[PDB]
Design a protein around this nucleic acid. Structure first.
Lengths: 261, 261
DNA sequence: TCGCGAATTCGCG
DNA sequence: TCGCGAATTCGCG
């Protein structure tokens, strides 16, 4: 709670900064707050890197590639920091997804459906893709104790409250939030193991079962619950919060740089 | 290696059985081989179940649902067995995916692309969806030591060798296997942590890092490497193999039923 | 070049 | 009914 983020946030709002530009601005704020630490922003990671990180855990892992310069490209990029051993440690990965143009149709008068008949459109499964990148960055961070992955959802397919949109003929159509003809929110909940959405799940839980002990890598899933678009200021504050808690977890491998610089 | 599967396999080939009907036939073979064990086949699992399995690991897990009767429906169903405590243990989950209709276009004469110009079509990312279900059944089986998930890939987007298709005008067009304009095989490799495709990865590896010890749940990804469709006999034999090794892992909780029945 | 992402309508039980 | 899956063309750097 250092005040400087109040100025940064109002900058984002004053410019309608998308997720990618907000993560770039988060890097700026971080280096402003921690001037002796070294941050950077990437817009992609190559599969070779991920595989290289994998076989460092176990020799039999990470031994596959079919397209040589294949890569993943989170539309909000990766913010990293440099630790005391010169290694780069990811402190933020962000992505922003959209589904369900229903509120647009109902705001206007366009009747959708197979025969121009429907008010609503049966929600599709495109949002299932979001699990691939989460898997990639999870495997990338399989040796870290923090998973700083933030997903930002938007659209009529991601409602957490009931909303009423009125047509150009006075017709109030109602979007019922828990309706399985619209709500695709459940399609993401496997990523944080059914832990709460709209919350920062950055620090990894360790759960057991038998002698079977294991680590969970949960993603932070945030929803514009009322159908509207995201406020860049809030989007910014969330990312700053998830990145700082990442820095808290990295605190051991950052000490030298912070005390002697 | 009990012979009976030779007859079963030739049955599948003689009928072109899709993945779902092959898994149903696998159940039949299993109960034929293990007549004192109790198997069953489901075609879906409800999110409530998955959440119920999750909070059995940790109280804070599995506490989310937005659509009440939301479910997942692997197009090859789930084969289970009943253990000595009356509990049902999944021994097989199978799914079959398709991408890249290129070999059809080149077999015929249809030039694709924005202006009816191209021989090839730039491969899309629909195959990324396959990670959701893998996540769901992984969370479902987070307390098991075996992950019996088999994925069957088919299409010009999943080639492991170079193939040559000749047009109705003598034109040999060549599909180069490691071409990143066609090959989407890398889009699955996060599921088995870069371990070998076309192999049975059913038994879970335990890898460490610090004191940080963890369990990996790797999916079996099989490819029709030469673009063609799957032979139901082989598809069958693979599923039977992955399911039996599942039974091997369950061997402790199955003893009573096998010795006293 | 090459390789990555976007998220869509609608069928089906 | 309601809710799940299918996998597609093509833009963009």
């Amino acid at each position: 709670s250092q005040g400087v983020i109040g100025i940064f946030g109002d900058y984002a709002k004053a410019h309608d900064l998308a997720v990618g530009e907000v993560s770039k601005l988060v890097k700026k704020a971080l280096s402003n707050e921690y001037p002796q630490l070294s941050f950077r922003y990437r817009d992609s990671i190559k599969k070779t890197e991920i595989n290289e990180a994998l076989k460092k855990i176990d020799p039999d892992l990470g031994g596959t590639l079919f397209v040589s310069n294949s890569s993943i490209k989170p539309d909000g990029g990766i913010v990293e920091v440099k630790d005391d051993y010169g290694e780069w440690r990811v402190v933020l990965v962000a992505e922003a997804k959209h589904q369900g143009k229903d509120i647009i149709n109902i705001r206007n008068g366009l009747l959708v459906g197979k025969r121009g008949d429907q008010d609503l459109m049966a929600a599709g499964n495109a949002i299932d893709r979001s699990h691939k990148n989460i898997s990639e960055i999870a495997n990338f961070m399989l040796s870290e104790s923090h998973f700083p992955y933030v997903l930002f959802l938007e659209g009529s397919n991601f409602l957490t409250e009931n909303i009423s949109i009125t047509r150009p003929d006075g017709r109030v159509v109602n979007l019922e939030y828990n309706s399985g003809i619209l709500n695709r929110l459940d399609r993401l909940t496997a990523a944080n193991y059914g832990m709460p959405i709209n919350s920062n799940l950055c620090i990894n839980k360790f759960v057991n079962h038998k002698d079977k002990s294991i680590m969970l890598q949960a993603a932070s899933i945030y929803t514009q619950g009322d159908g509207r678009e995201w406020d860049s200021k809030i989007m910014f504050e969330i990312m700053f919060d998830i990145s700082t808690t990442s820095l808290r977890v990295l605190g051991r491998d950052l000490f030298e740089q912070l005390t002697s610089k």
